[PDB]
Amino acid sequence: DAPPLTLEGIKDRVLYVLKLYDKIDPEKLSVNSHFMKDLGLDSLDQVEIIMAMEDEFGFEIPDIDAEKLMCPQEIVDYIADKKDVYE
């Protein structure tokens, strides 16, 4: 039970959920693709991305932390810090 998350696995899953989102073309996306500057998304889209991250990994990200995760690497680092990966 309870398989341990790694940085590579979390990165794969976050980029995987973002490659299934029809407002992001999956060839322009990288780990540092900023959602408002590089990917050109709405703040509503950023909220929906963080809610899909919550539905993916199973834990709520609070709004004071949700309104600041603006690239996928920030999301991977946040899930890493809140789940203590690479023990």
């Binding site: 609070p62 709004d63 004071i64 932390d65």
Partner: protein, 155 residues
């Protein structure tokens, strides 16, 4: 700790109110004391009477179980408004509507139990018939006395 940081008497002059507000680590505009009716509060602030469940749980508290910071002026009933105890959090349904619905449901159910007790259901049968004078010796009747003959016939 020393004398001038302990709670004192009710402030009346605005400089005493300002020194009290500085003592309790809060703004003068937010510092309301209890009304000076002589109940024993003194200069202690009337914090707005909320439970600690309503505090922001994602905020990093100095006391996460209590949802309370260090140096923050505690409510007078802080031991009462802990999360193991009385909650003041906003309810989806209005409080008066909750009271009316629960009282109406309980009173209506007790009224209908009184109605069904007044009008009971039963079966289209007679009484259950027992031999030996409705089992006189079995029910604890004394053998020196003799009951009246209870007789059941065939039908």
């Amino acid at each position: 700790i020393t004398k001038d940081m302990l709670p004192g008497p009710y402030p009346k002059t605005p400089e005493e109110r300002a020194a009290a507000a500085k003592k309790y680590n809060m703004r003068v505009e937010d510092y309301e004391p209890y009304p000076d009716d002589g109940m024993g509060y003194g200069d202690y602030p009337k914090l707005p009477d909320r439970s600690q469940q309503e505090r922001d749980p994602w905020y990093d508290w100095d006391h996460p179980d209590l949802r309370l910071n260090w140096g923050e002026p505690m409510h007078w009933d802080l031991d009462m408004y802990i999360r193991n105890r009385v909650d003041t959090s906003p309810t989806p349904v209005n409080w008066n509507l909750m009271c009316k619905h629960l009282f109406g449901f309980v009173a209506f159910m007790l009224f209908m139990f009184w109605v069904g007790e007044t009008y009971p259901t039963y079966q289209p049968v007679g009484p259950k018939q027992y031999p030996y004078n409705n089992l006189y010796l079995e029910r604890g009747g004394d053998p020196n006395k003799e009951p009246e003959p209870v007789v059941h016939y065939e039908i």
